[PDB]
């Protein structure tokens, strides 16, 4: 029964400036845990579907970096300990977005990036020919 009566919605102002057009966004996420990337993918894909964004997911091949260290503090060179760091990937490829749509989607999924997961967002922006290149001056 104790429910808010009216809610102040955040003010979104439509500007008089034209919006940016993104042909593609490539959201590459890196992690040490595959199940955490599975959960993040499900969340990211569901968010895209609910917002009307075309999304395709693929898994780039994993990178395993290995290195060797001595076993003992002193001598015993033949005995080693070998460590590794596994980097797993998931690539969300969004298409045909505007600057506003990308700004909202990226803020939403980036704020919910789980601990231990990095992201590299490659943004392809559609532009028109510079005004100076329309015709030669010579």
């Amino acid at each position: 029964v104790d429910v808010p009566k009216d809610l102040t919605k955040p003010v979104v102002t439509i500007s008089d400036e034209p919006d940016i057009l993104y042909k593609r966004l490539s959201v590459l996420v890196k992690g040490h845990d595959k199940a955490v990337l599975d959960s993040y993918e499900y969340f990211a894909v569901l968010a895209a579907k609910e917002l009307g964004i075309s999304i395709k997911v693929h898994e780039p091949p994993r990178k395993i970096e290995r290195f060797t260290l001595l076993q003992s503090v002193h001598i015993y060179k033949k005995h080693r300990v070998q460590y590794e760091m596994r980097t797993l990937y998931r690539c969300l490829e969004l298409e045909h977005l505007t600057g506003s749509t990308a700004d909202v989607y990226l803020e939403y999924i980036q704020r919910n990036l789980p601990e231990g997961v990095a992201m590299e967002v490659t943004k392809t922006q559609l532009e028109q020919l510079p005004e100076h290149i329309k015709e030669p001056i010579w």
Binding site: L69, V81, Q82, R86
Partner: protein
């Protein structure tokens, strides 16, 4: 409060080298070409040699930041093999596991 006097000497070298880096780069550029006159390049040779010895970057040593071990240090973590393994074997380094394949 550094681990030992050796670490403290490296701290001072890194500080002095930082302060003189621009001057050393400018003078060294005068010497690393065949364009400028050799008379000028000889005076630059003396000038860079007169700078304090602890400004020379080759004297800096990558010691373990925790124990000051001068060898067996992994550059990415700046830790000796012993200290790195202690933290890794206790599961305290994100994403580092024992390798088997």
């Amino acid at each position: 409060h550094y681990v030992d006097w050796r670490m403290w000497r490296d701290v001072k070298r890194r500080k002095m080298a930082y302060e003189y880096a621009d001057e050393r780069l400018r003078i060294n550029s005068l010497r690393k070409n065949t364009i400028l006159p050799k008379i000028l390049q000889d005076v630059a040779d003396e000038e860079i040699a007169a700078l304090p010895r602890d400004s020379c970057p080759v004297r800096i040593r990558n010691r373990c930041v925790m124990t000051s071990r001068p060898r067996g240090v992994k550059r990415r973590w700046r830790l000796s093999r012993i200290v790195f393994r202690h933290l890794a074997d206790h599961g305290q380094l994100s994403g580092i596991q024992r390798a088997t394949w």
